[PDB]
């Protein structure tokens, strides 16, 4: 079953979106020093997910 | 103390396998973060005078950590697609850290 590589580019183009998104929720990880002014959640927005 | 039970951490389960034991990823990687922290945050509390002994206290204790994390490190970065979610440093921007703990 082959192959009409229009689906192989949208397989990609949200898999990476799966990426830069997965570098915003959990983006609030790696900051991360005292006080701690852990000024932003890093598994923050539950309404927002 | 940190630097002690972390490779310690690496002792205990040197036996077994990679680990499917992820709390022992968190376990030294996240407790590693914690009680790094604590060190940092405690830092701040004294700023040097002697510019000798920035230089000093800030050599000594990067001799102490890094090359512990730079095996240790290099060793369990093989465990996620996503380590991120579990180890937060690299020894690139833990270095940093260290070099502006010494304003």
Known sequence: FEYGVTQFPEIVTSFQEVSIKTTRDLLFAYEKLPIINGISVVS???KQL | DLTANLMDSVFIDSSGKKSKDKEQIKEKFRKFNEGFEDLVSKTK????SDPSLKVTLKSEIISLVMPMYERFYSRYK???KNP??????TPDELTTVLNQLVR
């Open chain 2, 45 to 48: 509390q004294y700023k040097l």
């Open chain 2, 78 to 80: 093989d465990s996620f």
């Open chain 2, 84 to 89: 991120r979610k579990h180890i937060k440093y």
């Open chain 1, 44 to 46: 923050y927005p539950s």
